[PDB]
Design a protein around this ligand. Structure first.
Ligand SMILES: Cc1cn([C@H]2C[C@H](OP(=O)(O)O)[C@@H](COP(=O)(O)O)O2)c(=O)[nH]c1=O
Ligand SMILES: [Ca+2]
Length: 129
């Protein structure tokens, strides 16, 4: 896999954001995770977490997996990095997302994320509290 440039347009919530990619606005959905919706427990916290990471970032990158790059809603499906730190992994490590939506063929970072979730679970963080 490889990282490609993008710039932030707008934070949306814990696991979605609007980025400019190859010069075009698109909404991205984070691969392999599920944050609570804003109206759910920890939703506001997940939103804030992702917003801070992307807004503070000097460099945002998107990394597609090997499979589908757009979902049925037209959202880009990627791993998204802020100054080299993967947001998908960071949310999970903090107990602000569950590993979820693991579809065959777009699952390159599955085991990395599951290891993060185990450690969040051990620490009884947030969702796991
Ligand atoms: C993360 C992800 C979501 N989706 C689809 C599955 C779910 O369909 P349904 O809308 O029919 O439930 C939805 C969940 O996204 P959200 O968690 O953003 O609601 O997005 C994908 O198809 N591929 C993906 O990799
Ligand atoms: Ca969600």
């Amino acid at each position: 896999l490889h990282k490609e440039p993008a710039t932030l347009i707008k934070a949306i919530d814990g696991d979605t954001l609007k980025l400019m990619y190859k010069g075009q606005p698109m909404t991205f959905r984070l691969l392999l995770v599920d944050t609570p919706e804003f109206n759910e427990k920890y939703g506001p916290e997940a939103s804030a977490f992702t917003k801070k990471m992307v807004e503070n970032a000097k460099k945002i990158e998107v990394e597609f997996d090997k499979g589908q790059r757009t979902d049925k809603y037209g959202r880009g499906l990627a791993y998204i990095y802020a100054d080299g730190k993967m947001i998908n992994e960071a949310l999970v490590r903090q107990g602000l997302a569950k590993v979820a939506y693991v579809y065959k063929g777009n699952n390159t970072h599955e085991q990395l994320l599951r290891k993060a979730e185990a450690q969040a679970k051990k620490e009884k963080l947030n969702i796991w509290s």
